[PDB]
Amino acid sequence: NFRRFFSKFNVQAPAVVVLGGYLPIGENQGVNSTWYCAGQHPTASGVHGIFVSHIRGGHGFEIGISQEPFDPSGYQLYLHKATNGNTNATARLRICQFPSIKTLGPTANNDVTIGRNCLFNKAIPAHMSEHSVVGITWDNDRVTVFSDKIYYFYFKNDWSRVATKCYNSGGCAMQYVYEPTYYMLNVTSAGEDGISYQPCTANCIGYAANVFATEPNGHIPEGFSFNNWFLLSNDSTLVHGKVVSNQPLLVNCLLAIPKIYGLGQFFSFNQTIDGVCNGAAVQRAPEALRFNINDTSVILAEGSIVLHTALGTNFSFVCSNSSNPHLATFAIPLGATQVPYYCFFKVDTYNSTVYKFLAVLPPTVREIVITKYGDVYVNGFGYLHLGLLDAVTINFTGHGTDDDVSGFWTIASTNFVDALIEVQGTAIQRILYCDDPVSQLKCSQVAFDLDDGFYPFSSRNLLSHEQPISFVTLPSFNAHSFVNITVSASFGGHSGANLIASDTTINGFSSFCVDTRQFTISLSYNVTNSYGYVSNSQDSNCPFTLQSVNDYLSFSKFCVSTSLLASACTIDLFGYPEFGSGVKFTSLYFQFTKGELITGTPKPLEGVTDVSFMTLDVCTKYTIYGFKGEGIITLTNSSFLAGVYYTSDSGQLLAFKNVTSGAVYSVTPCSFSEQAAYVDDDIVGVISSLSSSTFNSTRELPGFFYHSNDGSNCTEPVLVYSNIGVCKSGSIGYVPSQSGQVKIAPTVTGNISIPTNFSMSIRTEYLQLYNTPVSVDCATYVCNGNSRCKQLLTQYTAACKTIESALQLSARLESVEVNSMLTISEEALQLATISSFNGDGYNFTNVLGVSVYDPARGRVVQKRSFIEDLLFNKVVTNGLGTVDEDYKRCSNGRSVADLVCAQYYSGVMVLPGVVDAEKLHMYSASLIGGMVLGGFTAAAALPFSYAVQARLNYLALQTDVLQRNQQLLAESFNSAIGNITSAFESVKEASSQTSRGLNTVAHALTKVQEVVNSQGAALTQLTVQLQHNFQAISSSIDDIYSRLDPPSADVQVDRLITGRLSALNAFVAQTLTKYTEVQASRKLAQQKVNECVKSQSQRYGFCGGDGEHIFSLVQAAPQGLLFLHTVLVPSDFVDVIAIAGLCVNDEIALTLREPGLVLFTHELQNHTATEYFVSSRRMFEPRKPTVSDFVQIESCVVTYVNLTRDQLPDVIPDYIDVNKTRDE
Ligand SMILES: *[C@@H]1O[C@H](CO)[C@@H](O[C@@H]2O[C@H](CO)[C@@H](O[C@@H]3O[C@H](CO[C@H]4O[C@H](CO)[C@@H](O)[C@H](O)[C@@H]4O)[C@@H](O)[C@H](O[C@H]4O[C@H](CO)[C@@H](O)[C@H](O)[C@@H]4O)[C@@H]3O)[C@H](O)[C@H]2NC(C)=O)[C@H](O)[C@H]1NC(C)=O
Ligand SMILES: *[C@@H]1O[C@H](CO[C@@H]2O[C@@H](C)[C@@H](O)[C@@H](O)[C@@H]2O)[C@@H](O[C@@H]2O[C@H](CO)[C@@H](O[C@@H]3O[C@H](CO)[C@@H](O)[C@H](O)[C@@H]3O)[C@H](O)[C@H]2NC(C)=O)[C@H](O)[C@H]1NC(C)=O
Ligand SMILES: *[C@@H]1O[C@H](CO[C@@H]2O[C@@H](C)[C@@H](O)[C@@H](O)[C@@H]2O)[C@@H](O[C@@H]2O[C@H](CO)[C@@H](O[C@@H]3O[C@H](CO)[C@@H](O)[C@H](O)[C@@H]3O)[C@H](O)[C@H]2NC(C)=O)[C@H](O)[C@H]1NC(C)=O
Ligand SMILES: *[C@@H]1O[C@H](CO)[C@@H](O[C@@H]2O[C@H](CO)[C@@H](O[C@@H]3O[C@H](CO)[C@@H](O)[C@H](O)[C@@H]3O)[C@H](O)[C@H]2NC(C)=O)[C@H](O)[C@H]1NC(C)=O
Ligand SMILES: *[C@@H]1O[C@H](CO)[C@@H](O[C@@H]2O[C@H](CO)[C@@H](O[C@@H]3O[C@H](CO)[C@@H](O)[C@H](O)[C@@H]3O)[C@H](O)[C@H]2NC(C)=O)[C@H](O)[C@H]1NC(C)=O
Ligand SMILES: *[C@@H]1O[C@H](CO)[C@@H](O[C@@H]2O[C@H](CO)[C@@H](O[C@@H]3O[C@H](CO)[C@@H](O)[C@H](O)[C@@H]3O)[C@H](O)[C@H]2NC(C)=O)[C@H](O)[C@H]1NC(C)=O
Ligand SMILES: *[C@@H]1O[C@H](CO)[C@@H](O[C@@H]2O[C@H](CO)[C@@H](O[C@@H]3O[C@H](CO)[C@@H](O)[C@H](O)[C@@H]3O)[C@H](O)[C@H]2NC(C)=O)[C@H](O)[C@H]1NC(C)=O
Ligand SMILES: *[C@@H]1O[C@H](CO)[C@@H](O[C@@H]2O[C@H](CO)[C@@H](O)[C@H](O)[C@H]2NC(C)=O)[C@H](O)[C@H]1NC(C)=O
Ligand SMILES: *[C@@H]1O[C@H](CO)[C@@H](O[C@@H]2O[C@H](CO)[C@@H](O)[C@H](O)[C@H]2NC(C)=O)[C@H](O)[C@H]1NC(C)=O
Ligand SMILES: *[C@@H]1O[C@H](CO[C@@H]2O[C@@H](C)[C@@H](O)[C@@H](O)[C@@H]2O)[C@@H](O)[C@H](O)[C@H]1NC(C)=O
Ligand SMILES: *[C@@H]1O[C@H](CO[C@@H]2O[C@@H](C)[C@@H](O)[C@@H](O)[C@@H]2O)[C@@H](O)[C@H](O)[C@H]1NC(C)=O
Ligand SMILES: *[C@@H]1O[C@H](CO)[C@@H](O)[C@H](O)[C@H]1NC(C)=O
Ligand SMILES: *[C@@H]1O[C@H](CO)[C@@H](O)[C@H](O)[C@H]1NC(C)=O
Ligand SMILES: *[C@@H]1O[C@H](CO)[C@@H](O)[C@H](O)[C@H]1NC(C)=O
Ligand SMILES: *[C@@H]1O[C@H](CO)[C@@H](O)[C@H](O)[C@H]1NC(C)=O
Ligand SMILES: *[C@@H]1O[C@H](CO)[C@@H](O)[C@H](O)[C@H]1NC(C)=O
Ligand SMILES: *[C@@H]1O[C@H](CO)[C@@H](O)[C@H](O)[C@H]1NC(C)=O
Ligand SMILES: *[C@@H]1O[C@H](CO)[C@@H](O)[C@H](O)[C@H]1NC(C)=O
């Protein structure tokens, strides 16, 4: 049955969980089984658990558990009930130094007397249902009993041996357990019903949400919940954001432990921890092991956590509901998580036993992490610090037995690692380790996903620095002198707060001047306190400290005087006795000038007449003629005769001369900047000045080297930059010069070509219309609401006023421009829906938007088009425009503020966009319906084919309008619309974006993405400036005004006011640039819609590239319009012989009136019958000539066709001969 047994694990009804431990192992499934169910009385060894599965009315039952060594000193368990009284059948149990009953019997053959020493020899009730299961499990000196509840007892034992007496019950009555098993409870209802257990295999462990399988490299597998893995923090916890921090998240081993079992284990920071790691174990000694639990009752037991320091000191962890270990008793009379618990560490050594206070235990402890270097965290807060730990012991107490096996409580052997952390709601949700060079680049910025582009990357340096030290100065006769400066004082007096004497001498004198080239300071303290020790501190008001002068500092002169000296910087020495007199010693005055005459040394340098020493062609830390730096020194062929050390015009050291031999050595940095080509979420290529790197292929561009994994040429550049383009596979190649559409220049005669077989193509263009109006409160942003700071701010006059003035002026101008810009006609809107609009052959389904009666307050809603859905949802980070937060609830203050309120509390308020996406979509639909609105009323809803025909006739008169003539154009338009939709649907899939560049969908969507990102990026960059401390005491103005007196505080706060105001001014400057840029785009859109959408354009190439523009339609876009310019492109050209004009009988010249009209001979009758046709020069539309198309000219030319009055009517059928007709 087993329903009741798993029902004893109190679990919520609709939850599915994973079981573990020494559970009953299934009647038949697996090897398992082997229920005895008969009085055979078997014997086994190494058993870790036994069970009884069926109570057939209360049959007899006997248990004998002992040690395999058969020791007499150990405790033996023997449970005996040879009774069938059910309720009265109270089972006899004797946990004693007890008869190790070998086979069977109340006493039987054994050793040890019955009652030599007993811990429990009472009677226990043993009545339960037939399907009830009772069992006992022992492991790690912990014993668990399943008698109607999951009991738990700590008991030092070794119970690998068991002997039983059995009575038959249903064929499966009692059993042993040797190894842990698992189960899957698909619970659906409370009680014994709706449980639906099933057997298991090693795959169930990963199914638990709070445990994971460690990757072989030690990283957390993706998708982990991080339910309780709080990020560690010494001072404060971030509530929402992204942080790159050094945290112990690189786990070596994860020990999933069932909640019903406690853990007693020795953990050392010097050895790989034991236990069965769920994932791929790493044989590395932990430095930070993280414990995950469910309830505080596990830890509250005294001595649960014992920390052993490297010195051997032990810290016993004690929790109690009192406060004074020294003056109160900590024997706990309370439990069940009642009242706050005050937890301490009891220092245990036979010198002095003191208690160190951790913190008030929170009402719910979920993760405690203990690391070496002496640091312990509770719920992600570093309450207490210690010295270097080396070992930790854990003595836990199972769980609360009221909700168990809801997975496992786990402990993780982790190592510190710098990882990018995404946290929202003060809880982790995803992580990214900063080890992979791609991951290193990602952690260089703060982002998990990076758009395609070139990102700066630093050349990898030597991981082991081991840098030799270089030091070069002028040659001179070597000479070293020690300057010691001995200070003599006697402090303390009475009670340690008095003084007696104080004096100092410099080499036995009150003043000294260094004459030898080398010198080394060595301060000595001849100070004695009558009360104890003297604490010494050193001041500094010089470019150097006493410890720093020995670091190869160079001077022309260096004189030290204990008294005031002219032009001498001051350094003071402070002496602190045990009780803190706080007085200072004599001030040290250092008069010095820059030069190479003398140099401080840490030790008298070797060498004769020259002390310089340096290492060639190795990344080294150098001090060259006072120029401290790190770089590579290489001998070069330069022969600069003058000078000693050479520097660029910017003051950077370039090369220095050996002077002794005349050789010069160039100084270059150890590492050089590199550009990493990051496309398709991977590093595919690196632009570097180095000749080689960790890539199998390397191509040398004229200006730089390029390393990648693909040496082939790149012909389809996914990403372009400067003169080069990079493919998605890492290939590099020059961008080919795309050949544009050919345009035929008009001419009066000779061979010409008339384009034909026109097919239309849609070219997409996006133009931004407006920006989100941002109004920042300058006063509250700068002063942070501090009244006393506003008085100082007022001294800056209009610097604060002009910011908001310009911001509001720009916002109002943009608002009024776009408001007067958007004109909407309701009649056009009527014809803009699928039911009304009728595109015969033209598929406008992807372009039009449906309209339904909205139940929301009745007002009808017109859903935006499918293309608009694709453009908005897939790009907008918030999904919808209504997500823009409102400030009505922002001042409530009853909930923790989010990012919007965080920036609003600093005076930054974001006004809603001037026009909603709904209004923009209705405007686009209005334009689409108006391009087919043939009359002032709705009764003139022309079919789109008629509008297309009219627009075709506008640019070239159609002489043969057949059905297929429009059908081919309609088919081409439908195909191009399908291509556009496929391109919008997804990137580089279902629509090959190999055709990429300007006037394409990819460029438009990249522009939309950058537009929607820049507005947030600027605001975040503004808000982060508040964190900066502009060389003041602190970033908090009230903190400054509290630490300092009013005079100095005003000076200090003025530093940040200038810093914040300059940062605020920088934001305005970039927004005005954005406003200026968007104004030009908006002005073009007004020109674009009038000259392309509301009417076809005679301007060549204005509406979406070259070709004959037939029409264009507009779709709503984020903060702008997406123009879809439909343009005709020819597929073939007809070659005909143009005619300049006609001259009949050499007496009347006759030429074409229309400049954009040609006359030619075509087809079979071009030369066999000499037939003449006229047509537009834009499209091939042959038409017989008419007298209205011809004009008379006073004179002829040679190029004109030579005809006679009889032949002319053949050329011009409409011509009539007045003389011939009248004379008949
Ligand atoms: C809360 O505040 C506590 C301080 O009370 C911080 O504790 C520090 O934790 C860091 C680790 O995050 C400790 O840094 C480690 O120091 C070890 C020993 O330091 C000696 O050796 C280094 C290197 O030679 C010397 O520079 C140093 O002066 C000491 O002489 C190092 O061995 C560790 O090396 C690890 O990092 C390096 C990279 O730097 C890796 O290459 C190594 O492989 C290794 O992984 C490490 O540098 C620091 O000592 C702790 N300080 C104290 C006083 O204990 C907590 O980190 C802080 N917590 C938070 C969340 O802020
Ligand atoms: C865990 O339990 C859930 C809940 O279902 C309940 O518990 C099961 C153990 C059974 O005893 C169910 O009778 C009981 O309602 C299981 O979800 C259930 O899965 C089954 C398929 O295995 C669903 O049956 C099908 O459902 C589809 C869609 O409704 C129908 O078209 C089919 O004709 C067929 O009926 C069943 O609907 C579904 N329960 C509910 C409430 O939707 C679940 O499979 C089980 N195991 C795991 C691993 O979760
Ligand atoms: C038709 O088109 C023009 C029109 O000329 C007219 O028709 C001719 C048949 C003659 O009867 C012309 O007298 C008449 O105006 C013809 O173009 C003509 O081409 C000839 C040469 O092929 C030109 O003569 C030249 O004149 C220059 C001096 O200007 C001399 O130096 C040359 O040696 C040569 O003789 C003549 O000027 C020119 N006419 C005009 C008006 O430019 C054309 O040849 C004729 N036939 C065809 C097939 O087009
Ligand atoms: C690990 O933790 C367990 C759980 O607290 C510790 O067991 C506890 O040890 C104390 C000290 O002996 C026991 O107190 C004594 O109990 C006996 C009855 O057994 C009583 O007669 C004494 O007067 C005294 O109160 C306590 O009962 C016992 N808890 C349990 C559940 O058995 C254990 O000592 C810890 N071990 C280490 C190494 O830290
Ligand atoms: C220990 O883990 C369990 C789950 O893994 C959690 O404790 C349990 O929390 C649930 C609700 O979160 C409690 O459910 C309640 O049960 C009562 C009894 O029927 C019911 O009337 C309520 O409506 C509610 O459903 C459940 O009792 C509780 N189990 C306990 C406390 O044993 C929690 O994550 C951890 N417990 C603690 C105290 O932190
Ligand atoms: C700058 O150029 C000078 C001159 O070329 C370099 O001086 C050279 O230094 C080396 C090492 O000190 C001298 O080697 C000699 O070796 C003998 C035998 O072991 C030893 O007895 C000498 O005391 C000396 O060490 C070398 O003669 C000397 N060159 C001279 C004097 O012309 C110098 O190393 C170069 N670099 C710097 C940073 O000064
Ligand atoms: C004009 O464009 C519309 C765009 O909606 C075309 O209508 C849709 O055409 C597809 C052809 O693949 C139909 O097939 C499939 O339908 C399933 C279920 O609706 C859908 O999940 C697929 O993604 C795919 O769309 C689709 O049923 C049909 N109707 C829709 C999407 O509502 C139409 O065929 C084009 N040509 C005309 C109207 O002549
Ligand atoms: C701190 O605790 C450790 C162990 O908890 C003590 O080390 C034990 O010392 C006894 C000495 O009689 C040995 O028999 C044990 O084997 C040691 N245990 C371990 C794990 O090594 C240590 O003495 C304690 N130190 C103080 C100052 O209390
Ligand atoms: C270009 O114009 C010439 C005359 O202006 C056309 O005449 C061709 O002239 C060549 C030269 O001998 C002959 O071989 C061809 O047979 C002529 N073609 C015709 C149709 O008369 C020529 O056809 C025009 N087109 C091209 C491509 O040259
Ligand atoms: C402590 O560890 C020293 C280093 O050896 C290794 O240490 C860690 C990194 C693990 O890899 C461990 O398995 C190795 O032993 C030892 O030299 C030293 O003896 C160790 N000390 C003690 C007391 O075990
Ligand atoms: C800690 O909590 C105790 C509550 O326990 C109750 O009182 C004791 C005396 C026993 O009778 C026990 O059975 C009860 O449940 C308080 O009595 C005690 O004062 C608290 N500690 C402090 C310092 O206030
Ligand atoms: C237990 O013993 C009492 C006393 O004789 C009796 O009345 C009762 O029925 C017994 N119960 C069972 C379950 O045997
Ligand atoms: C410290 O100065 C006192 C003052 O004369 C002197 O007697 C004593 O010897 C000095 N001690 C040292 C270590 O210099
Ligand atoms: C300075 O102290 C050093 C030892 O630190 C000693 O060798 C040297 O002789 C002392 N010089 C003087 C002038 O006291
Ligand atoms: C210096 O001259 C040598 C010999 O002519 C030559 O091998 C070397 O490449 C030259 N180096 C530079 C930097 O000019
Ligand atoms: C790749 O480009 C280079 C530079 O133009 C050219 O020499 C080479 O032939 C190209 N590769 C192939 C396979 O044509
Ligand atoms: C291209 O135009 C020529 C001449 O007008 C015509 O014969 C041919 O069929 C056209 N091509 C197609 C694919 O219709
Ligand atoms: C994409 O374009 C090709 C050629 O222009 C066309 O055959 C295909 O039908 C288009 N795809 C869609 C979905 O219209």
Residue numbers in the entry: 31 to 1254
Please give sentences taken from the publication describing this entry.
The trimeric spike (S) glycoprotein of PEDV is responsible for virus-host recognition, membrane fusion, and is the main target for vaccine development and antigenic analysis. The PEDV S consists of an S1 subunit, an S2 subunit, a transmembrane domain (TM), and a cytosolic tail. The S1 subunit can be subdivided into three domains and two subdomains, namely the domain 0 (D0), the N-terminal domain (NTD), the subdomain 1 (SD1), the C-terminal domain (CTD), and the subdomain 2 (SD2). The D0 modulates the enteric tropism of PEDV by binding to sialic acids (SAs) on the surface of enterocytes.
We further obtained recombinant S protein of the PT52 strain using the porcine IPEC-J2 intestinal epithelial cell line, which is the native host cell line for PEDV. Having obtained the recombinant PEDV PT52 S from the IPEC-J2 cells, we subsequently determined its cryo-EM structure to a nominal resolution of 3.1 Å without imposing a symmetry constraint. Two of the three CTDs underwent an 82° elevation from the closed conformation to adopt an open conformation that was not observed in the structure derived from intact viral particles. Refined maps of D0-up protomers with CTD in closed (e) and open conformation (f) colored by individual domains. g Superimposition of the CTD-close (green) and CTD-open (purple) conformation S protomer models depicting the motion of the CTD. The D0-up conformation of the recombinant PEDV PT52 S also differed slightly from that derived from intact viral particles. While the identity of the PEDV receptor is currently unknown, the CTD motion observed in the recombinant PEDV PT52 S strongly suggests its involvement in host receptor binding. Another key finding is the up/down motion of the CTD that was only observed in the recombinant PEDV PT52 S but not in the intact viral particles. The lack of clear CTD motion in the cryo-ET and cryo-EM data of intact viral particles implies that such a motion may be an artifact due to the detachment of the S protein from the viral membrane.
